[PDB]
Ligand binder design. Structure first.
Ligand SMILES: CC1(C)OB(c2ccc(NS(N)(=O)=O)cc2)OC1(C)C
Ligand SMILES: [Zn+2]
Length: 257
């Protein structure tokens, strides 16, 4: 199956997922000088006060902190979005070294990692129906740089030892995602897709300009995870990021300056 290795990596995905060479694929490089301020954008609203996490899972590609989305809690709206989008899960993409790891890039700069908070448009009933629509999903992307530790990320870092291999999961309740947000909500936005197979083009990307800082120790533990399942040759879970894709006919809008 698909992965990030030499024989099943990003350059191979198009064979089983033709949309990989589509017209609105993600991620993309964000040319800050070409991005245009858009006054038509309404204030971005991130309301995670009632967010209820359920568990954390190593799916062999990354680890997902899943949330209970059966009720109107943890919602993203405003900005380029029409209606309400509900948080369903978040995960990260990171590198084998601090100099790489992010999927989106800023003026070609690669950050150490990137956090993806996934939300589905509530007008579609559920996530399954949402991914069949051009505006079914909204992913809030946040860059991670190595420096000071991010207090709010430690609970995630400490449970990773219990889900080292593919298929393992652990209870992960009462985690507050607000502890992973930077100060400013300044962002860039554009229409894109999932960055992992099936690469569906149903995503409105909202990428924050301000990255959060995490310690070398915290990201080092991310790199201790495995892509493989238990009892299999160990393949460290690193560099699970897709490189920048062609922008084609899309414009990146800025919410600031
Ligand atoms: C509800 C789940 C867990 O959510 B998802 C999913 C899959 C891939 C995904 N990648 S990304 N890098 O674009 O954020 C983001 C979300 O599909 C399902 C497996 C249906
Ligand atoms: Zn992602």
């Amino acid at each position: 199956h698909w992965g990030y290795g030499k024989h099943n990596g990003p350059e191979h995905w198009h064979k089983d997922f033709p949309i990989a060479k589509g017209e609105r694929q993600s991620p993309v490089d964000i040319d800050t000088h070409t991005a245009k301020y858009d006054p038509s954008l309404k204030p971005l609203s991130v309301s995670y006060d009632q967010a209820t996490s359920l568990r954390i899972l190593n799916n062999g590609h990354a680890f997902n902190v899943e949330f209970d989305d059966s009720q109107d809690k943890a919602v993203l709206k405003g900005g380029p979005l029409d209606g309400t989008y509900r948080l369903i899960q978040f995960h990260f993409h990171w590198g084998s070294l601090d100099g790489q790891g992010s999927e989106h890039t800023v003026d070609k700069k690669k950050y150490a990692a990137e956090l993806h908070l996934v939300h589905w448009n509530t007008k579609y009933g559920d996530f399954g129906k949402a991914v069949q629509q051009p505006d079914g999903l909204a992913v809030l992307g946040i860059f991670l740089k190595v420096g000071s530790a991010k207090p709010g990320l430690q609970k995630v870092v400490d449970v990773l030892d219990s889900i080292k291999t593919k298929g393992k999961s652990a209870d992960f309740t009462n985690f507050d995602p607000r502890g992973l947000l930077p100060e400013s909500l300044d962002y860039w936005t554009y229409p894109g897709s999932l960055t992992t197979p099936p690469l569906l083009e149903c995503v409105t990307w909202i990428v924050l300009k301000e990255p959060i800082s995490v310690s070398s120790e915290q990201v080092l533990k991310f790199r201790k995870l495995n892509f493989n399942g238990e009892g299999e040759p160990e393949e460290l879970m690193v560099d699970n990021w897709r490189p920048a894709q062609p922008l084609k006919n899309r414009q990146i809008k800025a919410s600031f300056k």
